[PDB]
């Protein structure tokens, strides 16, 4: 397994599209810092440490919209789109003046700095750039 | 130079009454109120559905033939407004209005821009005291456009200033009929002038 971060986002993206209540991911501190921001920004209900067959996992609780009407009653997504930016193949580092505005404010950009993992708005207000982790809306 | 040709065919093509002559524009001798169909052998045939390109071209030729300005000067003005700040639609109109030969018409010194040009072109005009014989002079706020002293006494200017005692002049302008003076107050807003022209369709013509 080459990218635990790309795995997590993808592990979530597949669960939200079959409308799972939760989905477990292998546990790591850096993943927690990422999920901490998805919960604080409302994309997920939150997460809680668990053990599966004696192994540390992170159970993530997912959010969706209300039951829609019409011929397809599947709720709108709370995570419409979650996508890796920086990757092991090409790492992506932006300065503070280069941080992109995701979806014109309706989305966030998670990115790791030497002050921690921050959202696009947190970095710009705190004034630091860093490795662009992903984008979510 | 300028178009210099028959001018009633312009209105008959554009489907709209453009005021390019003078008094005749208001008489029943107006070709537009007399044969309001395009010139030539086919003008009375039934128009087929125009294309989107046709519609935008027609707007542009409309606005341009209003001012009697050549396509070079017309677009160089258009491109200037594109670069400047704000809405390009208004600014392009404002700069068009800021032309001296248009002011001299808009101040009633002549009954047609085409005649206002010859007024400017023969020098019968001044700006802020100085003679200015350049129809393209961009008039700024505060400039005092007046008739040349050596030309104040001339039948055409009097008869034009006479019939100007009647009419009022736009909010962005000022005029003193007895002293043949005039003042450019400000850059016209979009609503301050109602041309039969959808300026966005002229923007869209160049965005191609």
């Amino acid at each position: 397994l080459t990218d635990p971060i790309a795995d997590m986002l993808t592990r979530i993206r597949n669960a939200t599209r079959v409308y799972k209540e939760s989905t477990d991911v292998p546990a790591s501190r850096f993943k927690e810092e990422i999920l901490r921001i998805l919960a604080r920004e409302g994309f997920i209900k939150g997460y809680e440490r668990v053990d599966v067959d004696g192994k540390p996992y992170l159970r993530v609780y997912l959010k969706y919209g209300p039951r829609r009407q019409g011929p397809d009653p599947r709720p709108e997504q709370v995570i419409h789109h979650i996508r890796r930016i920086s990757k092991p193949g090409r790492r992506v580092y932006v300065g503070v003046k280069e941080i992109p505005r995701v979806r014109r404010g309706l989305g966030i950009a998670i990115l790791s700095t030497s002050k921690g993992v921050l959202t696009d708005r947190e970095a710009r207000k705190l004034g630091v750039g860093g490795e662009l982790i992903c984008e979510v809306w | 130079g300028r178009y210099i040709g028959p001018v009633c065919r312009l209105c008959r093509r554009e489907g709209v009454k453009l005021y390019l002559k003078g008094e005749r524009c208001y008489s029943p001798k107006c070709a537009m109120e007399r044969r309001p169909y395009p010139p030539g052998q086919h003008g009375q045939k039934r128009a087929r559905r125009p294309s989107d390109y046709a519609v935008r071209l027609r707007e542009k030729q409309k606005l341009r033939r209003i001012y009697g300005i050549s396509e070079r000067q017309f677009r160089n003005l258009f491109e200037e407004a594109s670069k400047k700040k704000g809405v390009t639609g208004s600014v392009f109109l404002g700069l068009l209005e800021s032309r001296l030969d248009n002011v001299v018409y808009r101040l009633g010194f002549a009954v047609s821009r085409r005649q206002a040009r010859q007024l400017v072109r023969h020098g019968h005009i001044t700006v802020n005291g100085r003679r200015v014989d350049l129809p393209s002079y961009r008039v700024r706020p505060g400039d005092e456009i007046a008739v040349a002293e050596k030309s104040r006494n001339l039948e055409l200017i009097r008869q034009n200033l006479e019939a100007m005692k009647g009419r009022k002049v736009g909010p962005w302008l000022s005029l003193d009929v007895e002293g043949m003076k005039g003042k450019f107050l400000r850059l016209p807003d979009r609503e301050d002038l109602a041309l039969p022209v959808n300026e966005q369709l002229v923007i869209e013509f160049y965005s191609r």
């Binding site: 959010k63 309706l106 | 965005s207």
Partner: protein, 148 residues
């Protein structure tokens, strides 16, 4: 009420012994210029009947398009198979910068300033559908906040 624009009128043909038996199709977009748009594809043995059905189907299917001062709230990429439409919000002075098919849908939406680009297959039918699904997917800060 709603305003109608005819995007496309084409003549398709089937075959049988004796030759080609034709049929006509009509893309018609409809809208109020205040935030309601509708797309309909009408197919009939003659041109006026097809333009009729097209407007009818068009009013049967509409979209909210949350305008914000004449532009759209956010940029959006939508692909309706091989056809891709880009919608980017623009400043109040810009204008509707689009091909004829999206422009027709955006002007009847009431969009007065926007940036667009057609990518991939520029089939007007599928560009039209791709434009509608894009509008249909536009959300506001209100929609977003209310979801999270």
């Amino acid at each position: 009420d709603f305003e109608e624009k005819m995007i496309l009128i084409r003549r398709t043909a089937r075959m049988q012994a004796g030759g080609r038996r034709f049929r006509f199709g009509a893309l018609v977009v409809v809208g109020d210029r205040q935030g309601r748009v509708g797309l309909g594809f009408g197919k009939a043995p003659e041109v006026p009947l097809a333009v009729q059905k097209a407007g009818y189907y068009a009013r049967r299917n509409m979209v909210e398009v949350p305008l914000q001062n004449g532009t759209i709230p956010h940029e959006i990429e939508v692909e309706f198979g091989a056809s891709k439409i880009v919608l980017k919000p623009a400043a109040p002075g810009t204008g509707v910068i689009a091909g004829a098919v999206p422009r027709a849908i955006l002007e009847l939406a009431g969009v007065t300033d926007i940036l667009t680009k057609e990518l991939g297959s520029r089939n007007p039918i599928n560009i039209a559908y791709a434009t509608m699904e894009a509008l249909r997917q536009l959300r506001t800060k209100a929609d977003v906040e209310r979801l999270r």
